[PDB]
Design a protein. Structure first.
Ligand SMILES: N#Cc1ccc(COC[C@H]2O[C@@H](n3c(NCc4ccc(Cl)c(Cl)c4)nc4c(N)ncnc43)[C@H](O)[C@@H]2O)cc1
Length: 377
């Protein structure tokens, strides 16, 4: 048995190719993704949903976004910039960063591959729990733009987990293989992979000829995703509250939370029907917030951000010296591409051209890694 693991920034996912069909193994909690979270608490260490869920109670010893630190040096523009926004401690141990935590009363320090080895250990377990066998061999994916150092730090992060990493594979190639774009014959095809998750955005252009892949260019926005979209809604509703009820709820962390949470959920609903209702009882100072939102209004709150996504598309076409009519295939991954106006912009931008999207976008990377781990098996 060999697995494909999509090791992501916010979530990880693990799959196995069995009985001629891929299976996205579910966790001990029944979820097909597992947050890449690791908490340290007085008595135990927590990974996945257990860690995600006590992040309010222990925000200072609950680590996440370790993919943003992996393989980088302490002075990397990105280690520096992100550090400002993490409750936990990032520490310069001799030019290489470390996360230091409180864990059983003793303060311990951790390299990022140590912290990614824990997510990988858990994913290994998730599979071994499902398959009722030992799992060792894996494919683990990384973004196309990762360098040697960051590939090595990931590969090690697995070798530490007890994994036999058969291969490290680019996420947009994982998704290409998922869609069997690598079994098309004859002439070289150019493939654009649009990855829009919750917090990060990545465009990747690859050429594929005869099932041999090559990375042509990299683009993206490293702080754009579904979360910017929920914020647009939170502002629309906070204004709407102030209107009808002349109150400002925004300095009440809990009212805003109840609202955020209802906004992300409403957002998901708007990808499949044309409006979405919200009732939040006694939201602020005793007042009920009963409201509703159409898709068209949601689209308008985000109209600039939805378009803004086409720039990494252009900028990546630039750097790959390709005209948009030369793109043979478009592949959508990351759970935000489920938003229809986003698919509509992209289809219309690429002059009516179809989109490859039938595989679950959250899962497609892990799908292709598992398909591929099977061949290398
Ligand atoms: N269980 C679970 C689970 C699985 C994957 C993810 C990751 O999602 C990353 C981003 O993708 C966004 N998103 C997602 N994410 C997938 C998802 C599916 C179910 C649940 Cl309960 C959750 Cl909450 C998230 N679906 C969207 C949709 N249908 N329309 C618009 N946006 C969608 C989501 O809001 C988030 O911002 C998050 C949760």
């Amino acid at each position: 048995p060999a697995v494909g693991i999509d090791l992501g920034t916010t979530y990880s996912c693990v799959g196995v190719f069995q009985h001629g069909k891929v299976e996205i193994i579910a966790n001990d909690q029944g979820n097909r993704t597992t947050p890449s979270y690791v908490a340290f608490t007085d008595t135990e260490r927590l990974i996945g949903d257990a860690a995600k869920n006590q992040v309010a109670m222990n925000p200072t010893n609950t680590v996440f976004d370790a993919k943003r630190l992996i393989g980088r040096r302490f002075d990397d523009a990105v280690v520096q910039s992100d550090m400002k926004h993490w409750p936990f401690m990032v520490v310069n141990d001799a030019g290489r960063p470390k996360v230091q935590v409180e864990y059983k009363g003793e303060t311990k320090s951790f390299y990022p591959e140590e912290v990614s080895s824990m997510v990988l250990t858990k994913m290994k377990e998730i599979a071994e729990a499902y398959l009722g066998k030992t799992v060792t061999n894996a494919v683990v994916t990384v973004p196309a733009y990762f360098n040697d150092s960051q590939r090595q730090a990931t590969k090690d992060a697995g070798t530490i987990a007890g994994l036999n990493v058969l291969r490290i594979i680019n996420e947009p190639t994982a998704a290409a293989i998922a869609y069997g774009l690598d079994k098309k014959v004859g002439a070289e095809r150019n493939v654009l992979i649009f990855d829009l998750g919750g917090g990060t955005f990545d465009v990747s252009i690859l050429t594929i000829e005869d099932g041999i892949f090559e990375v042509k260019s990299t683009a993206g926005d490293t702080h754009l995703g579904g979360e910017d979209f929920d914020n647009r809604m939170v502002n629309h509703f906070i204004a709407e509250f102030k209107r009808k009820h002349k109150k400002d709820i925004s300095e009440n962390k809990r009212a805003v939370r109840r609202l955020r949470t209802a906004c992300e959920r409403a957002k998901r609903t708007l990808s499949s029907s044309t409006q979405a209702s919200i009732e939040i009882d006694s939201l602020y100072e005793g007042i009920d917030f009963y409201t509703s939102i159409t898709r068209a209004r949601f689209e308008e709150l985000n109209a600039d951000l939805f378009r803004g996504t086409l720039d990494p598309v252009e900028k990546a076409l630039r750097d790959a010296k390709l005209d948009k009519s030369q793109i043979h295939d478009i592949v959508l991954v990351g759970g935000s591409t489920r938003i229809p106006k986003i698919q509509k912009l992209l289809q219309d931008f690429f002059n009516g051209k179809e989109l490859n999207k039938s595989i679950n976008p959250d899962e497609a990377v892990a799908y292709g890694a598992a398909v591929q781990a099977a061949i290398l098996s």
